[PDB]
Structure formats: structure tokens, C-alpha cells
Ligand binder design. Sequence first.
Ligand SMILES: c1cc2c(cn1)cnc1sccc12
Length: 253
Amino acid sequence: QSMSVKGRIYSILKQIGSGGSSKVFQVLNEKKQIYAIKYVNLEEADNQTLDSYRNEIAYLNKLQQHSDKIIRLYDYEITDQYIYMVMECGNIDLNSWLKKKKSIDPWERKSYWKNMLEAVHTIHQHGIVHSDLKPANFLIVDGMLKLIDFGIANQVGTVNYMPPEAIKDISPKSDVWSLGCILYYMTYGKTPFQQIINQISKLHAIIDPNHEIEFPDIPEKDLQDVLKCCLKRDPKQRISIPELLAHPYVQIQ
Ligand SMILES: c1cc2c(cn1)cnc1sccc12
């Protein structure tokens, strides 16, 4: 099959993912280069959803120039009926990659972490708080992690990465909580609260200071401190991203 985004023609190779009303495909242009096209159906879209879409796009377009850890958006076609986005094609999302591999290399992880701070830090600088980070939001492209979205436009639902303040009902400290959970999953093989099935009981645990989050002793003592810093329930007493980018775990060999 085929499709035309603006002037250019893109041959469909396979379907990467489907959000629901959205379909992501892997494509080829006339110069035979591989891309990822996102189809969005505006047929049953409120003017609020429309606005979230337009906002999320402009931001993704604006933030292209700032960080290389933000998915390349090459071109787009937008009508009253649909959205087409010509983005860079990654190998796999962090979630599926983590879900498959049993052993994660301390370097691969330290590297991925550094890429995760750079991405979140850039959206933060422009005023954005992602508010709902998950490994699904990150995409590996040439051993380099890239942020897919900014959680502006309307794995999903998962409360395992939710900060206590989001549950108590939101500042950059909320994204620090989530990022730490991601690291905790790449460190301990589970999210801090993955151990508790019942979603209501899982929620009571995040907001419970007496329910101690365990940090089992590891060779990377620095990595343990980062987790201990990110997973502090009081946003007031949680590490900031500029502070994390200067932590020994990230800076020291
Ligand atoms: C959304 C999702 C992806 C993308 C661009 N937008 C590019 N490559 C890949 S590989 C697995 C998911 C995706």
C-alpha cells in the first residue's frame, strides 16, 4: 500500500502501532529512506481534543531544535479530516525492549538514564511537565533513547509510575518520581509497587509513608542513592532534574 504526505509519496512497509483512532506505520519515501508515519482520525474529534493535538504537535516541532533526545518530526499534513506526521523510525519502544530482555547492562542502563534526563529536562525548560511517564513513552533509536510525546495530546492507564501528588487528587518533581520508577524497573526488574495486584491497595501504598519502598543492596551504590532520591514522597524533598544531571551516578565512570 501507499500514501502521500504533502508532495512526497510513502510506501507502507508494516504497521508499527495503533493508539485507537491513531495508526503508526513504517514507511519508505521516493529516495527509499525509512520513516514512521502517524495517521490520526479527526472524524470524531472535539474542539478540545483538536486543540490538544495541535498543541502537542507545535511543541514537538518547537523542541526539535533543542534536543536530539526528542523524536525527529520531518513533516506533517493536517486537514479537518486527518493528521499525517513524518517522524524518524526507531527500533523499539523501551517498554517492549525491557519486557523482552532478562538482563540489562549497567552501562546500557546508565546511558539510557542520561538520555531520559536530557529529554525530560528539555520539555521542563519550555514549561512542560509530562505528568505521565512510562517506558512506553521512550523509543530506542541507534542505542539512544528518545521521548515520543509530552503527554499534552488526549501501555496506558498504569498507576505503577504515578507520583503521590497526582494520586492525592503537579510540578517537574512529578516527572522525577516517574523517571525513578523507570530506573527502579531497570535496576530491580519490577516497579516499586508492582508487587501489589489490587489497584486501590496499590494506590494506598504510594501515598502511605509507613509503607517503606525497599532498595535491595547493589554494587552500584550511587544508583541506589538516585532511586532513593527520585522515590522521596514529598516533592519538596525530591531531587530536581538539574541536580540529577550533576549526580555521581550520571557523571562518574
Ligand atoms: C510513534 C511510535 C514509534 C515511532 C514514532 N512514533 C517510531 N518508531 C517506533 S518503533 C516502536 C514504536 C515507534
